[PDB]
Amino acid sequence: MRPPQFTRAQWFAIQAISLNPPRCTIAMRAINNYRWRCKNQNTFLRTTFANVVNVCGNQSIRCPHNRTLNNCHRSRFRVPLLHCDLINPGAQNISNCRYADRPGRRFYVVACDNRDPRDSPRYPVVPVHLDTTI
Amino acid sequence: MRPPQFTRAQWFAIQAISLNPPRCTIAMRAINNYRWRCKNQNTFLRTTFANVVNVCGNQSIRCPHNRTLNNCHRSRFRVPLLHCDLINPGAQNISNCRYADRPGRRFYVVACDNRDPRDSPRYPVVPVHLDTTI
Amino acid sequence: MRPPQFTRAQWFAIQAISLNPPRCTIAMRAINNYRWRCKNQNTFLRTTFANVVNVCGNQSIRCPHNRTLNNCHRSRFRVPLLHCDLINPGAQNISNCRYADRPGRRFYVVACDNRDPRDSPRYPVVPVHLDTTI
Amino acid sequence: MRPPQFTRAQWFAIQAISLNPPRCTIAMRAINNYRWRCKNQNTFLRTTFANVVNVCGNQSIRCPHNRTLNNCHRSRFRVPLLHCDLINPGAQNISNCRYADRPGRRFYVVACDNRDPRDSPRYPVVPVHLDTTI
Ligand SMILES: [Fe+3]
Ligand SMILES: [Fe+3]
Ligand SMILES: [Fe+3]
Predict the structure, then answer these.
(1) Which CATH architecture has domain C1-134?
(2) Is A44 within 8 Å of A103 (Cβ atoms)?
(3) Based on the number of CB atoms within 10 Å of its own CB, is C128 exposed (0-12), middle (13-18) or buried (19 or more)?
(4) Whether C4 and B117 lie within 8 Å, measured CB to CB
(5) I want to staple D2 with a disulfide (CB 3.0 to 4.6 A). Which of B128, C23, C124, D11 is the partner?
(6) Cα–Cα distance, D84 to D18 (Å, whole number)
(7) Do β-strands A125-133 and A79-86 pair in parallel, antiparallel, or remain unpaired?
(8) For residues A42 and A88, is the Cβ–Cβ distance under 8 A?
């Protein structure tokens, strides 16, 4: 599970949003610091939380990686991103996780839901998971 | 973390040892049933627990995926295996995880340690993690 | 924490239903094996799952320990129980959880909900948590 | 459960050191925000981290709640504290944990260990868990 101190949207933001991420091995430390083991893959969308919230407002579509769900939302434009792949998945802790970098520019698909009570009142509907990029 | 009901060696055996695994999408259900989210990658060694315990008994070498550790052990022979890769990493639960199959035959490297009190007394030293395959 | 391989009803039964429990220090081992740390308190209702499902048919009331919920149900009568209190809550693991036995006879209040798809199809409504005892 | 971003000493201080805590129902929110479920009990020692580090210099004793450990230390004197007891342990989440306040003055016993690499280098030995109070 996610760290209990974070809402789904807050944990989404920590993992999936970074406007100018450093190289993956550095950028991933901010995520893995909250974990017991290294995340095997992660995509940083180079955008803002507010921008993703706006994408939550368009037409509801099927989630490509969760095909029983239809609370997903696709961006109208391709966005710059940085994908990170764990090179040493046998790592037993987070002291030494190494990542390969794959920059790109793709549409993204997010699942959105009603906010958590701990979420800011500014956005009643928020992204809760990055489903995929296209 | 691992499920607390299992020792490191017991959880290793559930993930890493299967003599005749079915296709990955089926085989992985046995692992993911104990998890909240799908495992992103997994290698089934087509061998027995006792055989891996014997490999724990050879010369201690550096762990390729944990280079500050030197409690790893490499098999003397290549062993048949099945590697499973998660095709839909955006899956939000374990109901629908889909895997790609990659059979192979490789040396394996395991980290071994003294057993847990809950582990069987038969093996005082046991494999606790699959570090990598070669 | 509930192990994901169990439904809420299955986990409820494991923690809260035992017709003839042994001493608490023995009885609690089965529950604590699913945990990283000793459970601080646990009440074993000396009853059957069928008895509790019957109570789910009683008048719904507000849950005393979850006041925003109204799917709770109080037993019409007191039932025999074994309450277990953790003697050494400073324990850092589950190697030696020690409990004081407090046998008794009290009313119980359970929350009841529609069955999980994994639950038996023959009980459409099942107990999912022990709210309190009186 | 201790969030991995904290050392044992840091997590000890968060749970067990508060010089002037507010009412328990307020004071416990900071601890329960790191948790999925309400903590059943918690003792706030009204002291300073420097005071507790001094106690680590006292005569080592067997840990009362961890009898296989001998790195515990008892305070020479009673110290002011606030003990908090969970009123509604049937609570299913941390939305409304309610606590009873039990102010007091007791001896405390802490386990002390060598610092984590992430801990300040200026205290070579630090408290890592509150074993019990007397
Ligand atoms: Fe993992
Ligand atoms: Fe606990
Ligand atoms: Fe708990």
Answers:
(1) Roll (3.10)
(2) no
(3) buried
(4) no
(5) D11
(6) 13
(7) unpaired
(8) no
